Amino acid sequence: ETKCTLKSFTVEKGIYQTSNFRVQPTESIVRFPNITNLCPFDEVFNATRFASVYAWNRKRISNCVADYSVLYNLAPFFTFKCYGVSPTKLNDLCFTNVYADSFVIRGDEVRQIAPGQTGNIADYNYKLPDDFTGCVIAWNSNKLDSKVSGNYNYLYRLFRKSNLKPFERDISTEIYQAGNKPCNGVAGFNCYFPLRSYSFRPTYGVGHQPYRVVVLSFELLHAPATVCGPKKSTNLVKNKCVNFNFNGLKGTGVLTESNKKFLPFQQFGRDIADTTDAVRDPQTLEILDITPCSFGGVSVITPGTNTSNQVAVLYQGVNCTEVPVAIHAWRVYSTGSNVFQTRAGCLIGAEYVNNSYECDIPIGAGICASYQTQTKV
Amino acid sequence: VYADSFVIRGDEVRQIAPGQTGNIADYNYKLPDDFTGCVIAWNSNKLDSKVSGNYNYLYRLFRKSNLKPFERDISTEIYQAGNKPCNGVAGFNCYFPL
Amino acid sequence: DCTMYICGDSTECSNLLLQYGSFCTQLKRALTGIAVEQDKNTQEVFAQVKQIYKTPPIKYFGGFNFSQILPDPSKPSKRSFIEDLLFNKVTLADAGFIKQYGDCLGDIAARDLICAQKFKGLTVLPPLLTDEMIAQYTSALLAGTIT
Amino acid sequence: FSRLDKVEAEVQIDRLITGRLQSLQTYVTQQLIRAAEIRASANLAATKM
Amino acid sequence: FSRLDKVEAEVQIDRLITGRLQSLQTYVTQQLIRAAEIRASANLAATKM
Amino acid sequence: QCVNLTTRTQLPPAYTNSFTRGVYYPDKVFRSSVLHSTQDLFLPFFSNVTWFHVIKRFDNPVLPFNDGVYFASIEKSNIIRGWIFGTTLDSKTQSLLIVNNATNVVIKVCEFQFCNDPFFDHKNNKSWMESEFRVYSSANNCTFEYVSQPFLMDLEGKQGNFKNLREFVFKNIDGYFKIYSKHTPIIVREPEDLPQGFSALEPLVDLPIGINITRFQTLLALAGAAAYYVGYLQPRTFLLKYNENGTITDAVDCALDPLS
Amino acid sequence: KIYSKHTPIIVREPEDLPQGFSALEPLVDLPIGINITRFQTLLAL
Numbered sequence A: 001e002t003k004c005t006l007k008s009f010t011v012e013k014g015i016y017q018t019s020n021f022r023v024q025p026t027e028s029i030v031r032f033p034n035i036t037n038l039c040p041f042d043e044v045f046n047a048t049r050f051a052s053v054y055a056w057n058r059k060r061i062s063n064c065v066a067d068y069s070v071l072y073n074l075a076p077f078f079t080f081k082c083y084g085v086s087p088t089k090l091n092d093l094c095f096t097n098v099y100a101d102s103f104v105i106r107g108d109e110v111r112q113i114a115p116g117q118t119g120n121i122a123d124y125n126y127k128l129p130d131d132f133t134g135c136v137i138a139w140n141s142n143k144l145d146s147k148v149s150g151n152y153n154y155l156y157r158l159f160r161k162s163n164l165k166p167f168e169r170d171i172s173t174e175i176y177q178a179g180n181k182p183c184n185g186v187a188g189f190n191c192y193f194p195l196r197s198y199s200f201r202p203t204y205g206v207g208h209q210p211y212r213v214v215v216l217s218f219e220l221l222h223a224p225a226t227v228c229g230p231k232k233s234t235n236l237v238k239n240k241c242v243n244f245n246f247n248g249l250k251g252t253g254v255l256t257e258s259n260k261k262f263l264p265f266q267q268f269g270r271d272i273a274d275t276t277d278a279v280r281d282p283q284t285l286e287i288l289d290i291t292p293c294s295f296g297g298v299s300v301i302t303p304g305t306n307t308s309n310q311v312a313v314l315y316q317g318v319n320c321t322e323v324p325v326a327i328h329a330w331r332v333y334s335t336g337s338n339v340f341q342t343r344a345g346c347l348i349g350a351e352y353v354n355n356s357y358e359c360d361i362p363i364g365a366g367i368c369a370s371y372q373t374q375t376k377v
Numbered sequence B: 001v002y003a004d005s006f007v008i009r010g011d012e013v014r015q016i017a018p019g020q021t022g023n024i025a026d027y028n029y030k031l032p033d034d035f036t037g038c039v040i041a042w043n044s045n046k047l048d049s050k051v052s053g054n055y056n057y058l059y060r061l062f063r064k065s066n067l068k069p070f071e072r073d074i075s076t077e078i079y080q081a082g083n084k085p086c087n088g089v090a091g092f093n094c095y096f097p098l
Numbered sequence C: 001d002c003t004m005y006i007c008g009d010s011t012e013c014s015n016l017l018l019q020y021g022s023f024c025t026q027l028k029r030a031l032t033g034i035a036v037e038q039d040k041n042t043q044e045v046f047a048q049v050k051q052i053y054k055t056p057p058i059k060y061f062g063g064f065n066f067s068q069i070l071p072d073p074s075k076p077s078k079r080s081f082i083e084d085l086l087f088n089k090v091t092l093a094d095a096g097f098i099k100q101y102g103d104c105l106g107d108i109a110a111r112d113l114i115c116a117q118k119f120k121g122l123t124v125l126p127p128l129l130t131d132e133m134i135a136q137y138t139s140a141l142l143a144g145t146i147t
Numbered sequence D, E: 001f002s003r004l005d006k007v008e009a010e011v012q013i014d015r016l017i018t019g020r021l022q023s024l025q026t027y028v029t030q031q032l033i034r035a036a037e038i039r040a041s042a043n044l045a046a047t048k049m
Numbered sequence F: 001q002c003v004n005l006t007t008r009t010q011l012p013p014a015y016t017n018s019f020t021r022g023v024y025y026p027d028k029v030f031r032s033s034v035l036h037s038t039q040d041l042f043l044p045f046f047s048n049v050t051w052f053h054v055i056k057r058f059d060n061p062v063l064p065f066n067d068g069v070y071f072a073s074i075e076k077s078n079i080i081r082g083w084i085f086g087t088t089l090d091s092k093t094q095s096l097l098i099v100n101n102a103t104n105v106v107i108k109v110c111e112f113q114f115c116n117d118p119f120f121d122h123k124n125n126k127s128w129m130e131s132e133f134r135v136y137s138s139a140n141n142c143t144f145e146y147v148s149q150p151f152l153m154d155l156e157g158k159q160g161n162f163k164n165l166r167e168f169v170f171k172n173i174d175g176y177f178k179i180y181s182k183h184t185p186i187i188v189r190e191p192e193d194l195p196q197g198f199s200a201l202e203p204l205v206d207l208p209i210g211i212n213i214t215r216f217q218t219l220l221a222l223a224g225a226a227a228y229y230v231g232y233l234q235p236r237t238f239l240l241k242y243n244e245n246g247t248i249t250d251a252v253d254c255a256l257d258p259l260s
Numbered sequence G: 001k002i003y004s005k006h007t008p009i010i011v012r013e014p015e016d017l018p019q020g021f022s023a024l025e026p027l028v029d030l031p032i033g034i035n036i037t038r039f040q041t042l043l044a045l
C-alpha cells in the first residue's frame, strides 16, 4: 500500500500516511412507520352489490396506504388485466389521486372497457381517455350473483346520440331515436328505451355469465400525492455497521441506543457539523444514535526498502481494543502479541522497549521507532 | 462496430436511449451507462404490419431481475408471480413470459 | 482524509474523485509538509542543549529565588509554578490524546466539536515532543544558566 | 443519486466534488501561509533562546 | 474535437480549461509560498555573510 | 344558521409591541447546545401587532394573510372556537375551516359559503349548552376532511381569574399548510397586554390543502371578556440558541438593530 | 474477454507454479451476450 500510494517500488526510511482504515457495513437495514391506515378495497371490491355499467360508480381513494398485491392475494381467484402501465411498479409508487370506477358486464364486452376502443359499452356509457394510465380488474361473479331465474337488475345502455366523453357517465334515461321522424311520447316506430338487462343465470356460458369489474384510473407523480404504496422494512439491529434507510433519510453507520431525548416532532438529529448523527425509530418510537462506521488514518512505519520488508502500522487515534473488530470477514497485524498503545494511536508490528535512544522514525507523543539488532543468533 | 437490430412498439423508442428504465429496458434490452454509439429508429408498418395482425413480432413481459447491458435472454421458463412453487406449464399467477 | 471529506461514505463518489486523482495527494503532502515543520520548530527552539542538566539539591543562589521558575517534584508533570500557571490560560483544541469510543460515542459526542470534526475526516496529530519533554528541555536550559 | 440518472447526477456531483475540493485547497493554502508565519516566529524564538 | 460538434463540444473543453487553469493557479501559489521561504533563507544567508 | 347583526361598533384598532414572541421550531430536526442560523419567515421583534378585544363589545373582522401569520390570545373559558382561511370565503373558490366545538375538532377544505357575521352563543353556558352553528349556510365540495378528539387543554387545578395564553403560527408553503403552537399559564396583568418573556412554538399539524389563501377570520363565542393579537411573518434571517436538552431557549432577530 | 500467455519451462518436481513474473496478452473480445455463473474443463484420456 505505501508503494502504491507513493507510486514507486522503493520506499525510503520513514512514516507514510496511506488509505484510511474503514470497517464495512455487514448488511442493509430499512425502516418505515409500520403501515398506517390502509385504502378501502373491502368497499371497492368486497361490496354486497355493484353498480350496472350504465349506472357505473365512482369512488375516491385518499389519505391512506394502497396495497395492490394483497387485494389480488385475497381468497377468491379474480382475473386482473392491464392496458398501459407497469403493474409491479405501483406498490413502489405515489399518486396525486386514486380513482376507482366500478360496474357489471357480461364476459364479451370486457374488451370494450379499454381506451381507444369502440362498440356499445366503449361508446355510450363507459369511455376511458386515449391517454389512460392504469389497469382493469374483473371476476366471473357466477359463484355469488348469478340467479337461476335471471338476476336481470344488471342493465346496460346500448344507444347514445353521440359517443360520450372520457369519464362522462350518462344517467339521462331519454328515449333514443333510430328513425328520421320524431319520437314523441314513450314509444314509436324505431323509437327505443336506450337500455336493456342481462339474463344472467348459472347456465350462461363463457362470454355471457356475469362479471363484476373495477378500473383504477389514478393521476400520479406531478403534484402532491394523496396515496402511496406499501413501504418495506427489516428488523432493528444495534452496534454493527450497516447500510441504513429511515423514512427516506439515507446514510451508512452503526446504530446505537441514545440517552438524548428528542421533542415529540423531531425525526432526525444533526451534529455541530450540520449533518445527521441520530434518528427516531418510526415503527417503535426510540432515539437511536448513528456513528459513521469506525475508521482511523493508517500510517505505515518502514526502514528503507533497500534493507528490509518488515514494517509496522499505526492506527492514528485508535484504542488497540477496537481495531481487531475490523476482522476482514490486508490483515496479518491482527494476530497481535506485539501490540502497543501510544497516545498517537494503536501501534502494531514493532516491540516496545526501555532502551531510550535518540529518535530515528518519529511516531509522535514522545515515541520513536527504529530498525535495530534487538539483543540486550 | 457491432450493429444491433430488433422491432418494438414505436411509443417505447424513448427506452432505447442509454440509462433509461421501463419494460423493454429492464426486462430484455439495455444500453450501458457508458454507451458510445448511435440509435436509428423508423416506423416499418408498410413492411412489417399485416391487417390480420403480425403476431410473429414479440417482447418480454416478466423477468427474475433487471438484466446487465447487452445481455440477451431467450429463456422460455414460466415466471412464478404466485407465492408457492409452480411446476410445469401453468398455475395461479404463473406466466409464460413472451 | 480528502476522500471522506469530499465524499461522505460513498464508493461511487470515490470512483468520481479518481478522475481528479493527483489533487488529493498534493493536498495531503502539503499538509504533511506543515505537520513535519511543527516538530522541527519545537526542536530548533528547545532542543539546543545535548545534555539534560539538573540543579543541586541545595537551592541557594546569592539570595536570588528561582524556586518559582524551577521544577517542583510534587507535581506529576515536572513543570514550574509559572509553567503550570500558563497551561491554565490557553484553552487548547485536541491536545493529541486518544478518543476511545467509550467517549466519542454517547454523551460527549452530543456536544464535543472535536468528536464532530473527527467524523468529517479532519484530524489533529500529536507533537513529537510531549509537554513533559518540553518541560525537561526548559528545565535543562534554566538549570544550566543559573549554575 | 436519489432523484437523477447517471448523466445528470455525474454533472450535479461535479459541483459537489469541485466546491469541496476548492474548500480544501483554500484551507491548505491558508494553512501554508500560517505555517510560514509560525515558522518566522519559531526562528525568532530560537534566536532569542 | 475529432468527436463532438462546436455547440456541445465546448462544454467538455470548458471543464478542462477550468481544471488546467486551476492547476496552474495551484502551482503559482505553491511557488510564491516556497519562494517566500527561500527569501527568508537568502536574507538569513546575507546576514551570516 | 346566518344573521348579520346591526350592533357593530366600529373603532380604530389598537397596537401592541411584539416584544420577543413568535419564534417556532423551523424544521423537523434535533440540535443541542448550539447556535443555529436560519433564513425563514418569522414575526419581526418589537413590531406593532394589531390588538383586538371583546366584552358587550364584539369584533370579528376579516384580516389579510399575506405571507403568513402569528395569532395569540390571553383568555379564559375557550372563547375562540377556531379560524377560517381562504381567498373569497363565498364558494366562488375554496376555503379552509379549522374549529373545535364542545366535543371534537374538525378541519375541512370544502367550498363554504361563509356567513356575513359568524359566531357561537354560549354565555359561559349560564342558561344552555352547545346547540348553535352561525358559520355557513351551504357546503359545496368537501374535498378534504379530518375529525379528531377535542383540543385546547386547560391548565390544571386553576387559580383566581388566572388566564391562559395560546400562541399560533399559520403558514401556506409548497402546497402544505403548517400550524405551530404553544400554550402557557400566565399571571394576569391589568393595564398591560402581551406578556414579556420568551418561549418557542412546536409544530402542531401539517395538512396538504393546496388552495389559494389571501385572507382569514377568527370564530368567537357570544358577556365574555376575551382579547387577542395578530401579526404578520416576514422573511428574515434569525439566530436560534438550542440548549443541551435541545429546546430553542433564546433567539435574535438578525435585522433588529446594529448590535443584533 | 480472453487474455493469455505461453511460457516454456524446466520441470521443478515437488512444488507448483514457477515463481517468476510475466503479463498476459489480450487474445479476443467476444459478443457472447450471456450470463456465466458456472464453468467446466474439457480433457483427453
Ligand SMILES: *[C@@H]1O[C@H](CO)[C@@H](O[C@@H]2O[C@H](CO)[C@@H](O[C@H]3O[C@H](CO)[C@@H](O)[C@H](O)[C@@H]3O)[C@H](O)[C@H]2NC(C)=O)[C@H](O)[C@H]1NC(C)=O
Residues within 6 Å of the ligand: C065, C067, C068
Ligand atoms: C522563594 O519565594 C517563595 C514565594 O514567596 C517562598 O515560598 C513561600 O513561603 C511562605 C512562608 O513559608 C509560604 O507561606 C505559607 O506557608 C505555609 C504553606 O503550607 C502555610 O501554612 C502558611 O499559612 C502560608 O500561607 C508561601 O506559601 C510560599 N510560597 C510558595 C509558592 O511556596 C520561599 O520561601 C522563597 N525562598 C526563600 C529562601 O525564602
Ligand SMILES: *[C@@H]1O[C@H](CO)[C@@H](O[C@@H]2O[C@H](CO)[C@@H](O[C@H]3O[C@H](CO)[C@@H](O)[C@H](O)[C@@H]3O)[C@H](O)[C@H]2NC(C)=O)[C@H](O)[C@H]1NC(C)=O
Residues within 6 Å of the ligand: F099, F100, F101, F102, F103, F104, F105, F106, F147
Ligand atoms: C360538534 O360535535 C359533533 C360530535 O359531538 C360533531 O359531529 C360529527 O361530525 C361529523 C362530520 O360532519 C359526522 O360525520 C359522519 O356523519 C354521517 C354519519 O351517518 C356520515 O354521512 C359521514 O360519512 C360521517 O361518518 C359525525 O357523525 C359527527 N360525530 C358523531 C359522534 O356523530 C360536529 O361536527 C361538531 N361541530 C363542529 C362545528 O365542530
Ligand SMILES: *[C@@H]1O[C@H](CO)[C@@H](O[C@@H]2O[C@H](CO)[C@@H](O[C@H]3O[C@H](CO)[C@@H](O)[C@H](O)[C@@H]3O)[C@H](O)[C@H]2NC(C)=O)[C@H](O)[C@H]1NC(C)=O
Residues within 6 Å of the ligand: F245
Ligand atoms: C433537562 O431535562 C431534564 C428533564 O426535563 C431536567 O432534569 C430535571 O431537573 C429537576 C431540577 O433539578 C430535577 O428535580 C429533582 O432534583 C433532585 C434529584 O436530582 C431532587 O432532590 C429534587 O427534590 C427534585 O425532585 C429532576 O429530577 C430532573 N429530572 C431528571 C430526569 O433528571 C433538567 O433540569 C433539564 N435542564 C434544564 C437546564 O432545565
Ligand SMILES: *[C@@H]1O[C@H](CO)[C@@H](O[C@@H]2O[C@H](CO)[C@@H](O)[C@H](O)[C@H]2NC(C)=O)[C@H](O)[C@H]1NC(C)=O
Residues within 6 Å of the ligand: A033, A034, A282, A283, A284, A285
Ligand atoms: C407497530 O406495531 C406494533 C404492534 O403491531 C406497535 O407496538 C406496540 O405498542 C404498544 C403501545 O406502546 C405496546 O403496548 C405493544 O406491546 C407494542 N407491540 C409490539 C409488537 O411491540 C407499534 O405501536 C406500531 N407502530 C406505531 C408507530 O404505532
Ligand SMILES: *[C@@H]1O[C@H](CO)[C@@H](O[C@@H]2O[C@H](CO)[C@@H](O)[C@H](O)[C@H]2NC(C)=O)[C@H](O)[C@H]1NC(C)=O
Residues within 6 Å of the ligand: A319, A320, A321, A341, C098, C099, C100, C102
Ligand atoms: C482503551 O480502551 C479500554 C476499554 O474502554 C480502556 O480500559 C478501561 O479503562 C478504565 C480507566 O482506567 C477502566 O475503568 C476500565 O475498567 C477499563 N476497561 C477495560 C475493559 O479494560 C483503556 O483505558 C483505553 N486506553 C486508552 C489510552 O484509551
Ligand SMILES: *[C@@H]1O[C@H](CO)[C@@H](O[C@@H]2O[C@H](CO)[C@@H](O)[C@H](O)[C@H]2NC(C)=O)[C@H](O)[C@H]1NC(C)=O
Residues within 6 Å of the ligand: F002, F003, F004, F116
Ligand atoms: C346581510 O347584509 C348584507 C349587506 O346589506 C347583504 O348583502 C347584500 O344582500 C342583498 C340582498 O340579498 C343583495 O342584493 C346584495 O347584492 C348584497 N350585497 C353585498 C355587498 O353583499 C346580505 O345579503 C345580508 N345577509 C343576511 C343573511 O342577512
Ligand SMILES: *[C@@H]1O[C@H](CO)[C@@H](O[C@@H]2O[C@H](CO)[C@@H](O)[C@H](O)[C@H]2NC(C)=O)[C@H](O)[C@H]1NC(C)=O
Residues within 6 Å of the ligand: F140, F141
Ligand atoms: C365542485 O363544485 C363546483 C360548483 O358546483 C363545480 O363547478 C361546476 O361543475 C359542473 C359539473 O362539472 C359544471 O357543469 C359547471 O359549469 C361548473 N361551474 C363552475 C362555476 O365551476 C365543480 O365542477 C366541482 N368540482 C369537483 C371536483 O367536484
Ligand SMILES: *[C@@H]1O[C@H](CO)[C@@H](O)[C@H](O)[C@H]1NC(C)=O
Residues within 6 Å of the ligand: A042, A046, A074, A075, A076
Ligand atoms: C367481505 O366482507 C365480509 C363482511 O362484510 C367478510 O365476512 C368477508 O370475509 C369479506 N371477504 C373478503 C374476500 O375480504
Ligand SMILES: *[C@@H]1O[C@H](CO)[C@@H](O)[C@H](O)[C@H]1NC(C)=O
Residues within 6 Å of the ligand: A306, A307
Ligand atoms: C542498497 O543496499 C545494497 C546492499 O544490500 C547496496 O549495495 C546498494 O548500493 C544500496 N542501494 C542504494 C540505492 O543505496
Ligand SMILES: *[C@@H]1O[C@H](CO)[C@@H](O)[C@H](O)[C@H]1NC(C)=O
Residues within 6 Å of the ligand: A352, A353, A354
Ligand atoms: C522496563 O523496565 C521495568 C522495570 O523498571 C519492567 O517492569 C518492564 O517490564 C520493562 N519493560 C520491558 C519491555 O523490558
Ligand SMILES: *[C@@H]1O[C@H](CO)[C@@H](O)[C@H](O)[C@H]1NC(C)=O
Residues within 6 Å of the ligand: F015, F047, F048
Ligand atoms: C406603532 O403604532 C403607533 C400608532 O398607534 C405609531 O405611532 C408607531 O409609530 C407605530 N410603529 C410602527 C413601527 O409601526
Ligand SMILES: *[C@@H]1O[C@H](CO)[C@@H](O)[C@H](O)[C@H]1NC(C)=O
Residues within 6 Å of the ligand: F212, F213
Ligand atoms: C389561484 O391559484 C390558481 C391555480 O392554483 C392560479 O391560476 C391563480 O392565479 C391564483 N390566484 C391567486 C389570487 O392566488
Ligand SMILES: *[C@@H]1O[C@H](CO)[C@@H](O)[C@H](O)[C@H]1NC(C)=O
Residues within 6 Å of the ligand: B065, B067, B068, B071, G035, G036, G037
Ligand atoms: C446469472 O444467473 C444467476 C443464477 O440464477 C443470477 O443470480 C444472476 O442474477 C444472473 N446474472 C445475469 C447478468 O444474468
